[PDB]
């Protein structure tokens, strides 16, 4: 059947304990750093599974909601697949009525509606992460961050996941307005580097990135050269 | 969707719901009611009673047709969702019979509504009370006040709300057959019951009054100035 | 805390116990059946004088040959008497003859335990009516007095008497009636043993009789006729 | 460590911001007390389980944990014995149902992260429990040759190329992690064997365990038989 | 089931609605926003919450929205349940506009969304809308006006008003120095930098928007960042 | 404590309280008997009254002219129940144009009363039915309870102390079968009579007698008509 | 409080309710089930709780189909449920494809049913366990056996109840492979006036079912005749 | 066949129907009314389908009135013509559509005298002066010729009758008594009817 | 046919930085005319505005139900609509309706927002998307109308060269349809202006 009652309720002061906790779990997945600079934006996210046997070209946590929009996550792995299908999905149907990719910023309004129903809907918790949304429109790059509770905001670099108000603090010190793509990638695996523990390969890593072309998930190859 | 039984009975054989929705009753402002021979008023306390709101926007009394209206007391939001289901009904009555509905027959339906929510699954009962005041074909006054549980009564005057017991007897020892000889004693007892439960009576009171063969009339505060002075 | 349809350790519907404790603050309705015709009458209970009594309706009409007394709470009493109305009515339509007392009576009773959380339709009852009833009529076995509760058992008795004081007004016909009597000396013990049982002094604006006879119809005193057995 | 409310007792955001349902649900994987093992080799993926016989009576033969998906895909389930029909049951027609609706047989990893995705909604919705077991799927890709997924009760799958299972899984992946960074269809089987005889301690049997594979050059999931199944087990 | 139901749509011994009056305790740690009707326009004066070095502008503006040709609104409260409401108001108009071939009346759509509020807190068993809204526009029936709305589904028209952290502070100084009947735009602009001053700033920490008639048209417009800068200079030089 | 409040929660020991719980509502009511011979089966009701002045309640019920039956628990409950047993009694005439076995309308009782206990949010029937059949396989003495089990029994008695009367039954069943009509029915008078008190005894207007058998319809006697079982006993 | 739903795991990993469940399928009588080279014979003992129940009421055996038989334990109003529940499985099946259900399916298709009421709060597991046995000209002699939770597995000799631990070393002591039908008969009638307890129980019915080559691959219960003999020499 | 009219002046709308009411071959009624007052300045003139017409007239008019009741103001004549072309229209490929042609005449304070003209495919449209009916066709010219957008009440109803008389003498059908009405701004008038 | 029940024609053109868009305003069920003022173009937007010809109550409908959609897309994502975007959505509106489609055939004709590029297009009952370079007609004349723009219409025309070949098109096109005429309203869209005038037409 399924329960009909809101499993987020308010408190007595007026918090919303749900999106809270969820929030909680966010900030406690692998760090995610998002950079947006002058020609295009640069995702980049901590691939690291430490184990040696997990297969590191199978599983991804950049992913392309379309040609133009790229997506990563903090928080809970499996509700990302959720997201990042609902994603795909809002992408086809705008498209499908109006014969043009779905903006950037409309994209996130829609897939921050599905994250907001959930925090109010029947027998259900939360959304567990946090989503970086990058796109490329108009000729013009776009970076926007979509937290639990349904709430959207546009950035110009972010960081979220462990130590990301150490990230946010090295980030707003090392941040540039006339800053260049390949440059940008430069400021993002560097903020990542501040909270990786170990030692940082190419596929302990995984960088997104957004310009006039499209989004593209840089290989292996690409990300070595940078390191 | 939700089917949960939210009015049930108790040990006692009590509906805490039901009382709990008359207990927001007592909270909301007092309404005092008052049937006349020619006429029929209404008298409502505005407690926030500020001076930069629209207070058009802000009241108590309300018509259903052009021979009925009505006073609430309780929670405004239901009140509200209360008196636009009655209005269709109004608006129903006209469509199947010729003539306009009479006054018991939208306060049945308007009772019977609130009955059908204090035992029905996933929905809480109304927390208001109503004096539905109008006139029949025949021309008689009529007034009748429901209240949460759905059950209602006619009344020759009543009040409701904060306070509705100590007007409600200052009603019994003061409306005989010679208060409400003319049109003005008539109006002018509406204002005497409200002035023993308010502060400085006279700018935090708003009554409309109906006459036979007339649509609802809201006295302005310069009018209810007016009959204050005669009370003095 | 326990779902509506929940019984308890003695075999006892928790909702349906509650419902009949809630019949014990009513006011009482005093029914008297004879050979010719029944007899119901109720007290009114005004709780204020500016309070009309004529508004009050307590016991109603379920056709011409059936009248309806009821107890507890009032509210809930009119989901039934539509009920009632509209089974007589529907029988009449299809069979073209009045339904019996007991046709009646068990036509609302299956309502009485219609009700549950789990499994239902948006019309669905929360809890049980609590609110008892007092049908009286007569078919074609003459006068017939019914009475029905909460739980939905409907059965038949010479004098029944529901309300607040039930038990001291039960009694009181234990002793006072017999097959014998006739519809007016009924008429007079239900006065009588309302009068005792009431906590206001009787008269003709408290109290509400109604009778169906054989060859009438359901008729309810005016203040004249029930001002005439008042003295 | 910290709770409130009915966090322990439906899917729910704890404190910390973990789901203890879903985690109560891993330790359900190890109440069936068996290990699985499934290594990818290099044109052969090996999965090896544990075939106990608690009773003399039961019909050895139904007694099995490896099941036959599609013509191509095997897989072997661990934990709770109902769940996992259950899920071998959702698996074999989701796999059914993409041949039917693309024209082409379902990838290793797509199937995974299909039955990954039911399982996600276990986690999120309130009036169901999630599954108390775990999934290791083997098969051949026609781009990228063997595959080994698994899949588990929080609805997260991956890749691997030597996976384990049950109450031995720290065990039978420390020991695997210090081979794979040190093969062929018959080195891929013994490593498996061995991975699970050296965690166990028991030096199985023939029929003891059980073996299947999908080589490169016959990718149709097989059991190894009796026979089949013993003469790797005397070839050390 | 019936064990972890927490029952929002109940009522309580006091009679009060408890899942109510906790989303009220959730718009008083919102940003302020204030409405102040004038003579020839109204006015929303909305606090910034959403304030960084590493924020893109992006947006036209933050928390003002415009529902329709003649209508926008201020929201104070959980942002996502804002993005619903506002996004369902916008519907309500087109609908509205569609039928009669109209702009809706400022009073009637204000009504109609205040029914949907009303109705989460008597069934359906799920939690109400922890938003309050501000509305300002111009209809042919009334003019210019400014409504207000809380979680519970009330709603009432005012003169001057304020939702948000401080609207207790703020509504007592509009109490004492709104002229009315008197104001005018330009000094009604004045009123809200000195309360929104007074209750709290920078051109970047706030965002106002105006609502005038113009040629047989209604112009909603943000204040620009130098437009708002200037006023915040004015009020310095008489304090 | 936290055990018996649904249907749906199954205690520790490995037994369902609400269902426990529903049969103490079958005996709570008043005794009712049912025995059969070799070509009739008959339920005595001992009918209950509150006032002296109200009616006895109605124990026994028609449901087809082959089938009767005998409540004992929720008066609701049992109409419910008997008015599936018509409506399939109905069916099965109208589709196969015969009499629907005995039997098989007690298995169709037995899933509809059963569904009702595993589901949450639902309760089991409070009532507890003796049904007497008639058809190819002769005269039928069912037993149905509250937990969607029934018995197959050659004599039955359920409700208020309705020990006493199976006592009864227990000692003298064995001559049943060779015995006509007239000593059948006072030989279920006679247990009804047991779980009586010693005091007040069976009189003619709280004993109802239900009778059918192969050469005769289900029968219903109530006042006048039971005086002839009643006058023989001692 | 983690046993009080069948949606909840308790923090060792277990859902009490489904153990709760199988406390029902302990407390009830034994019956025990044995293929052998040719068919499945199926033995209940029932317990007869009173004097005026008929010799026969209270049956613990049912046909699901033509070819296969089902044994009970546990509630018996649960298990009626699931034995129709069976039958339309069965039907079902021969109006889709055309022929008998193999009861290896069967079984599979029935468990399944069974392992659904024990991930939900809206229902509760059943609480009972049952045998299936068939015999089939192309399969064989078959015999499976599903619990509470949903689990089903293939047996030689199964036994549910109360004593079903002493009643498993009396079918282990049988060669059943070897042996046939009718002389099958007549050991599990043995085992279960051995397992009967004469002083905590009173007196019970024995019930005897088969199914194989005997019968034609019919399930039935065994004849009068048969059971009779077999139930003396059991004494 | 049933005849409406109506005429749009500078600050008033003069409307007409007959009051003739048939079935088959014989007139039942010689004092049908076939307008509507929706408001207290708005009237409602339909014809067509012999149910159709009344369901749909008062449908409209009921929510017109409720319009009224719970907003305090009444709804003007462009919205009532909107709102129940929209209503037409939607009924249109439904199930059951009302076969039903109008007219509605209305006078808004701020926007004067209003006459819209609509037929059964819900096709709005604003005019100065139009009719309904078979009667149409013959007394159209006749407006057309005649009709100028200063005309005086006065001559407004001596423009009326003119096309009146023409049916009299040109129609086959027989009307001999219409209904007249005037709607400005003291609201609805009734004016003397029209008979021959 | 359904279609040459009210009548109607539309008509838009392309110029060097400009367009046109024109229509007949003869508002009439089948042979007897009703109004001669009948809206038949409507604005979607300062340099956007779309011609609907076929069925008035169907030219009402989908214009009124087309300006619902613009309004809340507008609003949503805050911008103006382009040219193309309107065409794909008038398309889609019209498909919805795919086996009980609405009779009218569209006619979009603007400047493109920000570059000013012109932009015509047309589309068939069940929203059939076909831009063209030159014109594009609808109506119940459009072989007429055909005719006309093809030996009419030059490549790069100005404003006024544009509007004079646009009138003398539909002026000539309406004058051999019977059911068409009554007025010609022609809008001539610029980047800077809009130009809206009445053509003296025949009354027949």
């Not at chain 3, 074609?140 to 019914?146: D, I, Y």
């Amino acid at each position: 059947r399924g329960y009909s009652f809101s499993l987020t309720t308010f408190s007595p002061s007026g918090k919303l304990v749900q999106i809270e906790y969820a929030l909680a779990a966010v900030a406690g997945g692998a760090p995610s750093v998002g950079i947006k600079a002058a020609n295009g934006v640069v995702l980049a996210t901590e691939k690291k599974q430490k184990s040696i046997l997990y297969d590191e070209r199978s599983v991804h946590k950049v992913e392309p909601i379309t040609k133009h929009i790229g997506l990563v996550y903090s928080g809970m792995g499996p509700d990302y697949r959720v997201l990042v299908h609902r994603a795909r999905k809002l992408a086809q149907q705008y498209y499908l009525v109006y014969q043009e990719p779905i903006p950037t910023a409309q994209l996130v309004q829609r897939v921050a509606s599905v994250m907001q129903e959930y925090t109010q809907s029947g027998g259900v918790r939360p959304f567990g992460v946090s989503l970086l949304i990058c796109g490329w429109n108009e000729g013009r790059p776009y970076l926007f961050q979509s937290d639990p509770s349904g709430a959207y905001f546009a950035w110009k670099a972010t960081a979220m996941g462990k130590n990301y108000v150490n990230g946010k603090t090295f980030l707003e010190k090392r941040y540039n307005e006339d800053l260049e793509l390949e440059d940008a990638i430069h400021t993002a695996i560097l903020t990542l580097k501040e909270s990786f523990e170990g030692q940082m390969t190419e596929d302990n890593i995984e960088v997104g990135i957004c310009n006039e072309a499209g989004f593209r998930r840089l290989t292996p190859t690409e990300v070595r050269d940078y390191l | 969707s939700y089917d949960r039984a939210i009015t049930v009975f108790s040990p006692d054989g009590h509906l805490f719901q039901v009382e709990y929705a008359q207990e927001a009753v007592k909270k909301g402002s007092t309404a005092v009611g008052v049937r006349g021979k020619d006429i029929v008023v209404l008298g409502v306390e505005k407690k926030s009673v500020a001076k930069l709101q629209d207070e058009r926007t802000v009241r108590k009394i309300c018509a259903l047709d052009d021979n009925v209206c009505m006073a609430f007391a309780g929670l405004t939001a239901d009140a509200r969702i209360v008196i636009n289901r009655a209005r269709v009904e109004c608006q129903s009555h006209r469509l199947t019979v010729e003539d306009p509905v009479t006054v018991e027959y939208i306060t049945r339906y308007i009772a019977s509504l609130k009955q059908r929510y204090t035992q029905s699954n996933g929905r809480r009962p109304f927390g208001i009370s109503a004096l539905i005041v109008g006139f029949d074909f025949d021309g008689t006054p009529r007034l009748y006040q429901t209240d949460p549980s759905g059950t209602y009564h006619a009344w020759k005057a009543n009040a409701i709300g904060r306070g509705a017991k100590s007007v409600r007897e200052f009603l019994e020892k003061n409306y005989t057959d010679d208060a409400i000889e003319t049109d003005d004693l008539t109006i002018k007892l509406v204002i005497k019951a409200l002035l023993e439960v308010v502060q400085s009576g006279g700018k935090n009171i708003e009554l409309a009054v109906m006459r036979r063969d007339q649509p609802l009339k809201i006295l302005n505060p310069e009018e209810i100035e007016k009959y204050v002075a005669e009370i003095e | 805390d326990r779902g509506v349809n929940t019984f308890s350790p003695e075999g006892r519907l928790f909702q349906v116990e509650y419902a009949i404790e809630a019949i014990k603050l009513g006011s009482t309705a005093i029914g008297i059946q004879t050979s010719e015709g029944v007899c119901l009458a109720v007290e009114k209970r005004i709780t204020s004088p500016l309070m009309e009594p004529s508004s009050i309706e307590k016991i109603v009409e379920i056709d011409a040959h059936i009248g309806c007394a009821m107890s507890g709470l009032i509210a809930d009493a009119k989901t039934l008497i539509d009920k009632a109305r509209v089974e007589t009515q529907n029988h009449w339509f299809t069979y073209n003859e009045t339904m019996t007392v007991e046709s009646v009576t068990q036509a609302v009773s299956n309502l009485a335990l219609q009700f549950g959380e789990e499994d239902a339709d948006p019309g669905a009852m929360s809890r049980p009516f609590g609110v008892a009833l007092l049908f009286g009529g007569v078919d074609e076995k003459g006068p017939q007095l019914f009475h029905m509760d909460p739980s939905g058992t409907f059965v038949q008795c010479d004098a029944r008497a529901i309300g607040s004081a039930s038990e001291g007004a039960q009694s009181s016909l234990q002793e006072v009636y017999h097959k014998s009597m006739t519809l007016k000396e009924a008429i007079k013990s239900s006065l009588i043993i309302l009068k005792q049982v009431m906590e206001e002094k009787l008269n003709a604006t408290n109290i509400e009789l109604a009778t169906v006879q054989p060859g009438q119809n359901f008729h309810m005193f005016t203040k004249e006729e029930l001002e005439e057995v008042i003295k | 460590g910290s709770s409130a409310g009915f966090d322990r007792h439906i899917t729910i955001f704890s404190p910390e911001g973990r789901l203890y349902q879903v985690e109560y649900a891993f330790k359900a994987i190890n109440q069936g007390g068996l290990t699985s093992v499934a290594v990818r080799g290099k044109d052969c993926a090996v999965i090896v389980t544990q075939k106990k016989v608690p009773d003399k009576l039961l019909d050895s033969s139904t007694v099995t944990h490896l099941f036959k998906i599609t013509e191509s895909i095997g897989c072997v389930m661990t934990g709770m014995t109902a769940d996992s029909r259950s899920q071998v049951q959702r698996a074999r027609y989701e796999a059914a149902n993409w041949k039917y609706k693309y024209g082409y047989e379902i990838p290793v990893d797509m199937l995974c992260k299909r039955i990954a995705d039911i399982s996600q909604v276990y986690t999120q919705n309130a009036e169901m429990r999630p599954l108390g077991c775990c999934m290791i799927l083997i098969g051949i890709d026609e781009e990228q040759g063997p595959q080994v997924y698994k899949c588990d009760p929080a609805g997260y799958y991956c890749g691997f190329k030597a996976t384990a299972a049950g109450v031995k899984q720290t065990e039978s992946t420390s020991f695997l992690e210090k081979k794979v960074k040190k093969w062929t269809f018959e080195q891929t089987v013994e490593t498996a064997i061995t991975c699970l005889s050296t965690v166990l301690s028991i030096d199985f049997k023939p029929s003891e365990i059980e073996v299947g594979v999908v080589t490169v050059e016959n990718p149709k999931f097989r059991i190894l038989t009796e026979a089949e199944i013993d003469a790797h087990l005397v070839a050390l | 089931s019936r064990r972890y139901d927490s029952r929002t749509t109940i009522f309580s011994p006091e009679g009060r609605l408890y899942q109510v009056e906790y989303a009220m305790e959730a718009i008083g740690h919102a940003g302020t926003c204030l409405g102040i009707l004038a003579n020839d326009g109204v006015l929303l004066a909305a606090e910034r919450r959403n304030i960084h070095k590493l924020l893109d502008e992006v947006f036209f503006s933050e928390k003002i929205y415009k529902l329709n040709e003649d209508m926008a609104c201020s929201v104070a409260g959980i942002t996502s349940d804002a993005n619903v409401l506002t996004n369902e108001l916008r519907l309500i108009a087109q609908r509205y506009l569609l039928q009669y071939q109209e702009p809706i009346p400022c009073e009637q759509l204000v009504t109609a969304l205040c029914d949907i509020k009303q109705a989460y807190t008597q069934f359906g068993g799920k939690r109400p809308f922890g938003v309050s809204l501000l509305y300002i526009g111009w209809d042919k029936h009334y003019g210019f006006q400014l409504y207000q709305s809380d979680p519970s589904g009330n709603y009432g028209g005012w003169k001057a008003t304020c939702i948000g952290n401080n609207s207790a502070a703020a509504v007592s100084m509009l109490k004492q120095d709104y002229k009315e009947g008197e104001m005018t735009l330009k000094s009604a602009l004045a009123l809200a930098v000195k309360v929104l001053n007074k209750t709290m700033l920078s051109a970047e920490k706030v965002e106002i928007a105006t609502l005038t008639r113009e040629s047989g048209k209604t112009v909603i417009r943000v204040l620009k960042q130098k437009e708002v800068e200037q006023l915040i200079k004015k009020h310095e030089e008489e304090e | 404590n936290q055990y018996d409040n649904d249907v749906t929660v199954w205690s520790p020991q490995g037994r369902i309280h609400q269902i426990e719980y529903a049969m103490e509502a079958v005996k709570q009511g008043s005794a009712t008997v049912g025995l059969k011979s070799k070509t009739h089966a008959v339920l005595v009701a001992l009918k209950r009254a509150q006032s002296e002045l109200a009616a006895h309640q109605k124990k026994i019920l028609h449901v087809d002219n082959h089938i009767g039956i005998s409540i004992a628990g929720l008066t609701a409950d049992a109409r419910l129940l008997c008015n599936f047993m018509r409506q399939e009694c109905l069916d099965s005439r109208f589709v196969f144009d015969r009499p629907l076995p005995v039997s098989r309308l007690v298995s169709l009782i037995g899933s509809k009363t059963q569904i009702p206990t595993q589901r949450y949010g639902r309760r089991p029937y409070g009532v507890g039915l003796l049904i007497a059949g008639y058809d190819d396989m002769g005269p039928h003495i069912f037993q149905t309870c509250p937990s969607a089990n029934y018995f197959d029994c050659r004599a039955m008695s359920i409700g208020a102390r309705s020990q006493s009367a199976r006592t009864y039954l227990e000692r003298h069943m064995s001559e049943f079968m060779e015995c006509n009509l007239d000593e059948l029915v006072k030989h279920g008078l006679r247990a009804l009579r047991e779980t009586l008190p010693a005091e007040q005894d069976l009189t003619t207007k709280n004993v109802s007698i239900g009778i059918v058998g192969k050469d005769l319809e289900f029968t219903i006697y109530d006042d006048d008509d039971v005086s002839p079982f009643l006058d023989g006993l001692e | 409080g983690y046993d009080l739903s069948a949606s909840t795991f308790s923090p060792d990993g277990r859902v009490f309710q489904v153990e709760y469940a199988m406390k029902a399928v302990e407390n009830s009588s034994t019956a025990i089930g044995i293929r052998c080279k040719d068919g499945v014979v199926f033995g209940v003992e029932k317990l007869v709780l009173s004097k005026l129940y008929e010799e026969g009421s209270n049956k613990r055996l049912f046909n699901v189909d033509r070819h296969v038989g089902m044994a009970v334990a546990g509630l018996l109003a649960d298990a009626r449920s699931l034995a129709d529940i069976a039958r339309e499985e069965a039907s079902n099946f021969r109006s889709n494809f055309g022929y008998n259900i193999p009861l290896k399916h069967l079984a599979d298709r029935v468990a399944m049913y069974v392992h659904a009421y024990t991930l939900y709060s809206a229902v509760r597991p059943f609480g009972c366990s049952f045998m299936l046995g068939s015999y089939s000209a192309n399969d064989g002699a078959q015999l499976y056996m599903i619990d509470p939770s949903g689990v089903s597995y293939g047996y030689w000799g199964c036994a549910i109840g109360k004593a079903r631990q002493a009643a498993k070393t009396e079918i282990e002591k049988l060669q059943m492979k070897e042996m046939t039908c009718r002389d099958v008969v007549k050991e599990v009638a043995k085992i279960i006036y051995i397992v009967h307890d004469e002083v905590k129980d009173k007196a019970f019915e024995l019930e005897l079912s088969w199914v194989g080559e005997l019968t034609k691959g019919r399930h039935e219960i065994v004849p009068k005749d048969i059971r009779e003999e077999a139930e003396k020499y059991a004494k | 066949m049933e005849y409406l009219i109506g005429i749009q002046g500078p600050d008033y709308v003069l409307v007409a129907s007959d009051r003739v009411a048939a079935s088959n071959i014989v007139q039942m009624k010689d004092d049908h009314d076939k307008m509507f007052k929706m408001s207290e300045k708005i009237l409602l003139l339909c014809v067509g389908e012999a149910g159709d017409t009344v369901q749909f007239a008062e449908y409209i008019q009921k929510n017109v009135q409720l319009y009224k009741m719970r907003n305090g103001y009444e709804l003007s004549p462009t919205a009532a013509a909107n709102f129940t072309r929209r209503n037409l229209a939607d009924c249109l490929r439904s199930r059951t559509p009302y076969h039903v042609n109008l007219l509605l005449a209305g006078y808004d304070e701020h926007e004067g005298p209003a006459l819209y003209y609509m037929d059964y495919l819900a096709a709005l449209a604003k005019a100065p002066f139009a009719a309904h009916g078979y009667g149409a066709f013959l007394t159209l010219s006749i407006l057309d010729r005649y009709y100028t957008p200063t005309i005086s009440r006065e001559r407004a109803v001596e423009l009326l009758r003119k096309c009146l008389e023409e049916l009299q003498k040109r129609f086959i059908l027989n009307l001999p008594t219409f209904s007249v009405r005037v709607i400005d701004k003291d609201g609805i008038h009734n004016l003397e009817n029209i008979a021959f | 046919s359904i279609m040459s029940y009210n009548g109607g024609a539309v008509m838009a053109m392309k110029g060097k930085n400009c367009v046109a868009i024109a229509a007949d305003r003869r508002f009439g069920i089948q042979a007897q005319m009703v109004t001669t003022d009948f809206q038949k173009i409507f604005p979607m937007g300062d340099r956007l505005y779309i011609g609907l010809a076929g069925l008035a109550t169907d030219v009402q409908t989908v214009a009124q139900r087309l300006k619902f959609r613009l309004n809340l897309y507008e609003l949503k994502e805050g911008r103006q609509i382009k040219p193309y975007t309107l065409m794909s959505m008038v398309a889609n509106l019209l498909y919805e309706k795919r086996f009980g489609p609405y009779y009218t055939e569209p006619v979009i004709a603007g400047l493109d927002p920000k570059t000013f590029k012109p932009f015509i297009c047309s589309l068939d009952l069940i929203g059939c998307p076909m831009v063209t370079d030159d014109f594009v007609v609808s109506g119940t004349c459009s072989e007429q109308m055909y005719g006309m723009c093809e030996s009419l219409w030059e490549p790069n025309m100005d404003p006024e060269h544009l509007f004079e070949t646009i009138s003398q098109a539909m002026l000539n096109a309406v004058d051999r349809d019977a059911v068409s005429g009554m007025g010609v309203i022609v809008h001539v869209i610029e980047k800077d202006k809009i130009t809206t005038r009445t053509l003296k037409a025949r009354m027949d």
